[PDB]
Write a protein that binds this ligand. Structure first.
Ligand SMILES: NC(=O)OP(=O)(O)OC[C@H]1O[C@@H](n2cnc3c(N)ncnc32)[C@H](O)[C@@H]1O
Ligand SMILES: NC(=O)OP(=O)(O)OC[C@H]1O[C@@H](n2cnc3c(N)ncnc32)[C@H](O)[C@@H]1O
Ligand SMILES: [Cl-]
Ligand SMILES: [Fe+3]
Ligand SMILES: [Fe+3]
Lengths: 679, 674
């Protein structure tokens, strides 16, 4: 029983179905593959087209999943899509009325066209199954829990009918107990508020990170005017007719000032985050207190995008409402993509389910075999120095004990937003200094952002308070207090309220990463490391060896450990050997605007990425002339010859474009097809 | 007592308050000036910045109104703005949360900044008055009616609180009788439906013109699912939670396929428009049947943007529900700007009002004095031939009788969307082939579109069925039946259903235009002309002399009559003497996207206008190089020398960009102050 689960919109690599298609129109595209009831492969398209939370059709994700499964497209028994057909087609139809030049192609025709043109795959109509959105979420969260029965709660921003749903799950059977309508979305509430802080879609985790720095008393009475808790676990959100934002009109009327780009976070801003987080917590605990008592159940699965609020999950864990709580690594729409595969199989006979609780999210493409990796690392010679230690974990453990910050790339990439030791950046977890050192310098993000610890299963309870229930910690789903007697010891991974988004690694969840942290513990007396995602501020988590090396070379990391090779950056790297390549969304433009006196203004030049929210950057006339000749094969050095050579000024200008990922820059050729490692 | 009325957003000429500010965020910007109760000047900003239904701050309109009144900024006693302060600021606040780079400037600071930087006018806080939106519509529509008591209905997309409001008016006082919430908007319903016919904001009256070609029965039962009439003049619209469009999900579920831009209008499209138009008529007449008998009024003023639905007005006229009906020429938000002035005046003293029913919309800037018009037409000599007939009206009537299609430009431009004899295109109303060609060749628009007649007041009842109530026909507010025995004769202006959006012109409403129509009637026996607005498909109604000549030369008009000068295009027009200028929104781009094997794709060049909805067009490599050197003073002939002479292909390529208004082309100099 081999079933593809699909989520996201339908745009091609280089264009969107409607020009500048909204980034909120079916985001976090992904593909999942199940076989005989198990999740055999899953990867978000963002890892492959390098567009954070992309909406584009997950064609690459499908190709990669089929390769990991050793399947042809025609081997696939069914395809599940994470919304009902009439709902997606109604939304598409609405986009088409707003863009009258777009041809009338609805989801079924588009899915078949993308697979046909992309994979030579001729999908028969009977193999495509469309699925209720909250059902998809519920299957994904509950079926990987290892539980045989559970209360299931789903809370997200937009199901077709509901923003919230409560189920009773038993075996492979879901029974809806309650629902909440779309305008009551707590995910929409959170996003609406997030905009008042100078942030936008995808920044919710930043707002959650900020909230402990604020006082929830300041705006508590203001938020009280936006919701009311009611009997039987009901609530209302109080809308308005003025703007599509629940929160902005009232806060404007009380003098709140939305944060501007590049501005600092005032105490008003910090307190707003704190009150927003406490609001969503109170409503969800209101829901769960009622449905715990009413259903009688002791086990909870929590899905939907809202279940990436690990602070909320920590409060659910400590509430004492449940004995067990499970949360999936990909609880946002990529998880509904997986769930849709299971719902498609259920629609076509009895449902085969996973045999055990999910412990590892290592499910995307691997980096490649040792032969092809070495070969490719050699293409990078003009830029890096490679060692081959005897025990790369031992060497890495010592280097971390020495105080270095490591890139750590091994095996199959993580499904969902957290890095868990397959595409990670790791450092010593004890010195506070590592916080501003990694935030400001190497990862280039805001300072209030705390860092997440990874600890061995054996030492977990010597450092963290996991009480209140038995939650799953392999995926950093839960924020838990750090025990007071360990707070100062864990100076880098302890938030202001003494809490931490802990990963608990085991020989089961990740043998190599468990070995690393254990071995570090023996060397140091503290088996806890800092673990943050391996990417800079302009890209999602790195996927390929090339992505890994590129990201190493464009951040200030000390050493990179990638499949037992120890990589360092040469003294002066020769950028001239790299071959520049446009991304599918790269645009290069010379512009003239209207001058005063109604002349043609003077030429300016820019590069940008053509998707909604895509970045943009000025380029010098000289780099514009160089980039216009990019052919995909000639090296940067050789292209620069046409403008007098790759001078230090040009190389610096190119490097800064590289850091923002406007172009692909890598040695000639590729690493070739990913080899059969025999697993 | 001198009061300025304002409406629109606050964007400058070249930038918008937020980048790509949506075209619906405070559109139809305009300024109005009232002195001693009388509307002395009014013009929409679109006529001056040449962006249809523009949202930009009406800076040029304010300056032009002050000049027409002979007033200085410091003379203005008050300024009214057509929405409450908190409402417009809440919307601005929302846009700022979506665009965190934009600084937190709200409407009071923005309005005073635009006036100070734009006019040198430091406006004190106490002179700025914000006004309820439907109250502003109501004042405008009622105070110009000539009536001393009336029922006043306002229907539009949305005021700050309501989609519709019903008032009692007596003397100068408005008292509210009823209101309808924002989700019940009939304006929003009609605009939602308009999006299904491949159209957008501003196109509603095209859908209106399509409706008589459709059968209203096909989708009647479908539309019946989106509204319910209730007792005592109430009604409800049934929304949905999938998409922000009331209409599209239901019609999708029944297999409706929204027309694509540049595809024909199928019979299902036509039937869709006909059922839509019937639906809104049913609901409005339901509202008005209740409130006429309840309020006791025999007279009705109807305003708000929905009052530009001339078909609806004609059914209100024939309904027998009222003895009299008045509709203002500018019932959309420009008219709300004017009403904001009256409300501002009322809050700062007693309220002076118009002495008479408004008969003329000729309220914008004029074309200029006779000598500056003659001198400026001389500057255009390399492209035009000019005659100076003894009696231009006499000559024009004869040319019309010989089958010529005339541009007609005189005096002050029309306020509101209809051309009424000051910026008009006119032709013989009799041959049906005139509608076919003027649609295809001159206005360059869809063949289904009807044409509106102008008739003399003395012959109106010989041709049209005006009966029922007494409505005002000076501004083409009402669709009326053409008399059956005249439908054959009026081949070009009788719509498929036998109706016509008539302008009845009189010596009092437009003396010169009336003389033209009367004289044409004397020559031919038919005192009726076709009268369409003087603009091509790429511009709003022409304003200045250079606008009129530009439009004449880039439309396929036979002859232009402008302030008694007879203008025709030269056999070979020398485009090289024209000085190209960028418009403030013109952008010139050389672009590369990704190509094969992740290469840089091949260069392309394009020109575009930088506003939401703005057009774009490809340009050749060599025109791109030419336009890159535009300095605003050098002629196109001199500019083309750098690229090796003004080729015949370059001139042709330039002419087509001129026709689409991507740049300004005009002889050196200008007409000077008017
Ligand atoms: N159907 C659909 O909309 O996709 P989805 O399941 O991925 O839900 C995303 C929603 O979860 C909310 N959300 C996401 N992350 C969140 C976080 N860390 N904290 C609070 N809310 C969050 C987010 O604001 C957004 O409203
Ligand atoms: N409300 C506001 O902000 O400005 P406003 O007074 O100018 O109203 C615009 C509204 O009039 C509606 N509208 C315009 N023309 C229309 C027509 N011919 N038929 C129906 N509705 C029309 C249009 O669809 C739109 O919903
Ligand atoms: Cl591994
Ligand atoms: Fe979801
Ligand atoms: Fe209005």
């Amino acid at each position: 029983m081999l079933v593809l689960g699909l989520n996201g919109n339908f745009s091609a690599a280089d264009t969107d179905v409607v020009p500048q298609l909204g980034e909120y129109f079916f985001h976090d595209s992904a593909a999942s593959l199940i076989r005989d009831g198990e999740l055999v492969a899953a990867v978000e398209e963002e890892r492959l087209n390098r567009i954070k939370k992309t909406t584009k059709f997950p064609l690459n994700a499908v190709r990669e999943c089929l390769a990991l499964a050793g399947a042809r497209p025609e081997d696939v028994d069914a395809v599940g899509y994470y919304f009902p057909e009439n709902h997606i087609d109604t939304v598409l139809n609405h986009l088409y009325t707003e863009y009258p030049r777009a041809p009338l192609r609805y989801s079924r025709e588009l899915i078949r066209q993308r697979l046909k043109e992309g994979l030579g795959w001729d999908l028969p109509d009977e193999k495509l199954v469309y699925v209720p959105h909250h059902e998809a979420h519920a299957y994904s969260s509950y079926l990987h829990s290892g539980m045989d029965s559970a209360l299931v709660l789903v809370l997200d921003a937009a199901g077709e009918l509901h923003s919230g749903t409560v189920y009773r799950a038993e075996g492979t059977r879901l029974e809806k107990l309650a629902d909440y309508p779309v305008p009551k979305s707590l995910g929409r509430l959170y996003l609406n508020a997030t905009y008042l802080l100078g942030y936008g879609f995808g920044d919710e985790y930043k707002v959650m990170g900020l909230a402990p720095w604020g006082n929830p008393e300041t705006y508590r009475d203001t938020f009280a005017k936006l919701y009311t808790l009611q009997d039987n676990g009901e609530y209302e959100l109080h809308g308005n007719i003025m703007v599509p934002n629940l929160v902005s009109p009232l806060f404007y009327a009380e003098g709140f000032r939305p944060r501007r780009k590049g501005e600092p976070f005032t105490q008003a801003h910090r307190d707003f985050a704190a009150a927003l987080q406490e609001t969503v917590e109170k409503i969800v605990l209101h829901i769960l207190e009622y449905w715990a008592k009413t259903s009688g159940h002791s086990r909870l699965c929590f899905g939907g995008g809202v279940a990436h609020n690990s602070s909320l999950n920590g409060l659910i864990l400590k509430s004492g409402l449940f004995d067990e709580v499970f949360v999936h690594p990909a609880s946002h729409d990529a998880g509904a993509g997986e769930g849709a595969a299971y719902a498609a199989a259920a629609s076509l006979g009895t449902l085969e389910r996973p045999g055990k609780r999910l412990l590892s999210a290592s499910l995307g493409p691997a980096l490649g075999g040792r032969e092809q990796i070495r070969a490719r690392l050699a293409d990078w010679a003009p830029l890096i120095d490679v060692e081959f230690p005897d025990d790369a974990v031992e060497t890495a453990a010592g280097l971390l004990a020495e105080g270095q910050v490591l890139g750590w790339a091994y095996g199959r990439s993580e499904f969902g937003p957290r890095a868990l030791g397959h595409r990670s950046i790791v450092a010593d977890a004890r010195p506070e200094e590592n916080r501003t050192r990694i935030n400001a310098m190497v990862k280039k993000r805001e300072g209030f952002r705390p860092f997440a610890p990874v600890v061995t299963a054996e030492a977990a309870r010597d450092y963290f308070d996991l009480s209140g229930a038995d939650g799953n910690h392999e995926f950093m789903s839960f924020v838990v207090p750090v025990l007071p007697e360990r707070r100062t010891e864990l100076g880098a991974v302890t938030h202001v309220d003494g809490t931490a988004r802990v990963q608990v690694v085991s020989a089961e969840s990740g043998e190599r990463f468990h070995r690393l942290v254990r071995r570090f513990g023996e060397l140091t007396g503290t088996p806890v490391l800092l673990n943050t995602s391996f990417n800079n501020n302009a890209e999602p988590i790195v996927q390929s060896l090339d992505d890994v090396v590129t990201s190493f070379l464009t951040t200030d990391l000390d050493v990179l450990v990638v499949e037992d090779c120890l990589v360092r950056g040469k003294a002066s790297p020769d950028l001239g050997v790299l071959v520049p390549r446009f991304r599918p969304v790269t645009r290069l433009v010379e512009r003239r605007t209207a001058g005063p006196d109604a002349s043609a203004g003077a030429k300016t030049h820019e590069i940008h990425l053509d998707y909604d929210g895509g970045p943009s950057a000025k380029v010098s006339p000289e780099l514009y002339e160089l980039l216009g000749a990019v052919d995909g094969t000639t090296t940067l050095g050789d292209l620069a010859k046409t403008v007098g050579g790759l001078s230090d000024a040009l190389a610096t200008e190119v490097f800064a474009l590289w850091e923002q990922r406007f172009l692909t820059l890598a040695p000639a050729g590729d690493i070739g097809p990913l080899a059969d490692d025999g697993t």
